[PDB]
Design a protein around this ligand. Structure first.
Ligand SMILES: N[C@@H](C[C@]1(C(=O)O)C[C@H]2OCC[C@@H](O)[C@H]2O1)C(=O)O
Length: 256
C-alpha cells in the first residue's frame, strides 16, 4: 500500500477546527473544516490515506535574519510532512523554498476592528495614534509588512516591530480577543474577516483589500505529489466543488 502521507496543518476557523463530540475522537476524526473536506476530496482523487498533524510550533512560517524558517514551511523544507493543507498563503519568498499547488482560494489583507471609529483605511490607521495594530507573528501578513516598500506599510511595519512582543499576536484567536478587549486592530486575511464578521456583530472590516493572493497546498521542493495535487485542485475548481465547500463552511449571513 501507498505510504500514509503526513499532513502538517494548523488550527484556523473554519479551515481546521476541533470537532465537537460527546464521545472520544481519535486521529483525523478530531478535526473538521474546509481543509479537512479538501483533504477527503484530494485523497480520493490521488489514492492515498493521510495522518493530520498540527504544526508543533503553532506557526504558519517566516524566515529570520539567518534565513531559518519555522512553522509549516519549515516542516516541508525539512521533509517532516508530505503536504501542508491549511490556509497557507502562496508567496514569492515561500515559493523559492517549497512547492505550492495552484491556488484553491483567493483573498487579500485587510483590517479587523470594532465598530464606531472614523478609521476608514490603512492610511488612516497608520496616521492616528489612539488605536494600536498588529498581525499574527510569523505569517504572511507580518511578512507583507516586513517586506513592503510602500511608505504607509513601511511605517506600519516599524510600528508593529517596535513593539513586537506586544503588537504581534500568537494566533488569530489572541488577535481577535485583543480587538474585542483593547484598542487594537488586527491586520487579517479577508476570508477570515468575512467569517468572523458574520458571527460576531461587534466586529467589522476597515477599508478594502490591500493586496490579492491565493492559498495553496504546500509540498517539499521536488515533491512528486505537487503536480498531482495541482491537477486535483483544478478538477475540484472546475466541478464547482471548491465553491460548494466555501459555501458550506462560511454560510450564512449573521450580522447587519
Ligand atoms: N495565511 C497566512 C497566515 C495568517 C496571516 O498571516 O494572515 C495568520 C492568520 O492571521 C489572522 C487570520 C488569517 O489572516 C490567518 O492568516 C500564512 O499562510 O502565513
Amino acid at each position: 500500500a501507498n505510504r500514509t502521507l503526513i499532513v502538517t496543518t494548523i488550527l484556523e476557523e473554519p479551515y481546521v477546527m476541533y470537532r465537537k463530540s460527546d464521545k472520544p475522537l481519535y486521529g483525523n476524526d478530531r478535526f473538521e473544516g474546509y481543509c479537512l473536506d479538501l483533504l477527503k476530496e484530494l485523497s480520493n482523487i490521488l489514492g492515498f490515506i493521510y495522518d493530520v498533524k498540527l504544526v508543533p510550533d503553532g506557526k504558519y512560517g517566516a524566515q529570520n535574519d539567518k534565513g531559518e524558517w519555522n512553522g509549516m514551511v519549515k516542516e516541508l523544507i525539512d521533509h517532516r510532512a508530505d503536504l501542508a493543507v491549511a490556509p497557507l498563503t502562496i508567496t514569492y519568498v515561500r515559493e523559492k523554498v517549497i512547492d505550492f499547488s495552484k491556488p484553491f482560494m483567493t483573498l487579500g489583507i485587510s483590517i479587523l476592528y470594532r465598530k464606531g471609529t472614523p478609521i476608514d483605511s490603512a492610511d488612516d490607521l497608520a496616521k492616528q495614534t489612539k488605536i494600536e495594530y498588529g498581525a499574527v507573528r510569523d505569517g504572511s501578513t507580518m511578512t507583507f509588512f516586513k517586506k513592503s516598500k510602500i511608505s504607509t506599510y513601511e511605517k506600519m511595519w516599524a510600528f508593529m516591530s517596535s513593539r513586537q512582543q506586544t503588537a504581534l499576536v500568537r494566533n488569530s484567536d489572541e488577535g481577535i480577543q485583543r480587538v474585542l478587549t483593547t484598542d487594537y486592530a488586527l491586520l487579517m486575511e479577508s476570508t477570515s474577516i468575512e467569517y468572523v464578521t458574520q458571527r460576531n456583530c461587534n466586529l467589522t472590516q476597515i477599508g478594502g483589500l490591500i493586496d490579492s493572493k491565493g492559498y495553496g497546498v504546500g509540498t517539499p521542493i521536488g515533491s512528486p505529489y505537487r503536480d498531482k495535487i495541482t491537477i486535483a485542485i483544478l478538477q475540484l475548481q472546475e466541478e464547482g466543488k471548491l465553491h460548494m465547500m466555501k459555501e458550506k463552511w462560511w454560510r450564512g449571513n449573521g450580522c447587519p
